[PDB]
Design an enzyme around this catalytic site. Structure first.
Site, PDB file in Angstrom:
ATOM      1  N   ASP A 290       0.824  -1.201   0.000  1.00 56.23           N
ATOM      2  CA  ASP A 290       0.000   0.000   0.000  1.00 56.23           C
ATOM      3  C   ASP A 290       0.857   1.250   0.000  1.00 56.23           C
ATOM      4  O   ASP A 290       1.325   1.675   1.047  1.00 56.23           O
ATOM      5  CB  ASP A 290      -0.908  -0.033   1.233  1.00 56.23           C
TER       6      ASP A 290
ATOM      7  N   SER B  99      -0.768  15.571 -12.049  1.00 58.67           N
ATOM      8  CA  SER B  99      -1.047  15.213 -13.430  1.00 58.67           C
ATOM      9  C   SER B  99      -1.295  16.472 -14.253  1.00 58.67           C
ATOM     10  O   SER B  99      -1.830  17.454 -13.753  1.00 58.67           O
ATOM     11  CB  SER B  99      -2.271  14.278 -13.488  1.00 58.67           C
TER      12      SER B  99
END
Ligand SMILES: Cc1nn(C)c(C)c1CC(=O)Nc1ccccn1
EC number: 3.4.23.22
Length: 330
Positions: free
Chosen positions: A35, A199
């Site tokens: 994770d 992004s």
């Protein structure tokens, strides 16, 4: 040193991925959910409340000759989906794919929430976010990656998750046979303890690319792609019959649909998530309503590039002095 381990989806929907991990001496092999959105290595154990264990493999520290109780130390974690676990702490030898760390904090669960109990395939989590998020008290502990880092050939790990198929976690090296083209690297902020990056935008299907900054985290421990409501609305508007359902808890769509792809930007580069990756199947057995793999982050407070996005790429988690993230197509 290096390590290399295969990671395998837990079910037919890729709801999560499990990777075998050797703990203790002799080795006890547990299948852990790696994770990158958390920083605790915790396991089902011989200490876990019996009624809360349902099929998981447990770690028994008393059977490990290298286990040592970390005196006074406790831990307690809650995840965004409302799940949780807590317990005490041992140090022990932990190996992943041939890479060994001695003195690793192994957090032994005394309590786990129902969602963990109900998932017989996940024996614990291995966190790979920054150690500043580790929950051990009163002495915070380091992640497996941080402990390993100085010994690695290169201070990196990579995630290569498969779509309906096994993939690979590598530590200490970049497998140049595992991706196509070039890896594009992008800046990371560690201020929130995550692999947080921005992004450069998105496209839906064959549509035009929208240049827009989307700050979010690369999180292997989250199933879906959670993005701003504007972006998510633009995606599902291209699927006839798709709608947001409050009763289901997100966007659903007719199972008869063909889903469009979703592209996200990494600098000037582009990663394309095929439409099929966005299908999470019937909302309940036999239903013709299917759950979407792109959902709004509006109620979360952060955008999350979870498995739906990451499995479309070869992803480099660069733990150099100034960390960065790299993405390649594959
Ligand atoms: C932050 C968040 N909010 N919401 C609604 C979701 C689903 C998340 C992501 C999340 O909980 N991931 C997770 C769960 C268990 C173990 C590890 N990671």
């Amino acid at each position: 040193s290096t390590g290399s381990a295969t990671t395998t989806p837990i079910d037919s929907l890729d709801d999560a991925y499990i990777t075998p991990v050797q703990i203790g001496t002799p080795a006890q092999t547990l299948n852990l959910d790696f994770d990158t959105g958390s920083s605790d290595l915790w396991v089902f154990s011989s200490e876990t409340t019996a009624s809360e264990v349902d099929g998981q493999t447990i770690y028994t520290p008393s059977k490990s000759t290298t286990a040592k109780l970390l005196s006074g130390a406790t831990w307690s974690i809650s995840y965004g989906d409302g799940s949780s676990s807590s317990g005490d702490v041992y140090t022990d030898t932990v190996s992943v794919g041939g890479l060994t760390v001695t003195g690793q904090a192994v957090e032994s669960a005394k309590k786990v929430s129902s969602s963990f109990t109900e998932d017989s395939t996940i024996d614990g989590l291995l966190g790979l976010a920054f150690s500043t998020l580790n929950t051990v008290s009163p002495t915070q502990q380091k992640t497996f990656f941080d402990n390993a880092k100085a010994s690695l050939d290169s201070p990196v790990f990579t995630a290569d998750l498969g779509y309906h198929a096994p993939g690979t976690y590598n530590f200490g090296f970049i497998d140049t046979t595992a991706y196509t083209g070039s890896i594009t690297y992008t800046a990371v902020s560690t201020k929130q303890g995550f692999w947080e990056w921005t992004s450069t935008g998105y496209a839906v299907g064959s549509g035009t690319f929208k240049s827009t900054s989307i700050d979010g985290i690369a999180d292997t421990g989250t199933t879906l792609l959670y993005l701003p409501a504007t972006v998510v609305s633009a995606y599902w508007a291209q699927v006839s019959g798709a709608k947001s359902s409050s009763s289901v808890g997100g966007y659903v769509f007719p199972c008869s649909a063909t889903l469009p792809s979703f592209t996200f930007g990494v600098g000037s580069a582009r990663i394309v998530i095929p439409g099929d990756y966005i299908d999470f199947g019937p909302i309940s057995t036999g239903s013709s309503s299917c759950f979407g793999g792109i959902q709004s982050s509006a109620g979360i407070g952060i955008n999350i590039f979870g498995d739906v996005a990451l499995k479309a790429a070869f992803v480099v988690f660069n733990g150099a002095t100034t960390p960065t993230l790299g993405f390649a197509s594959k």
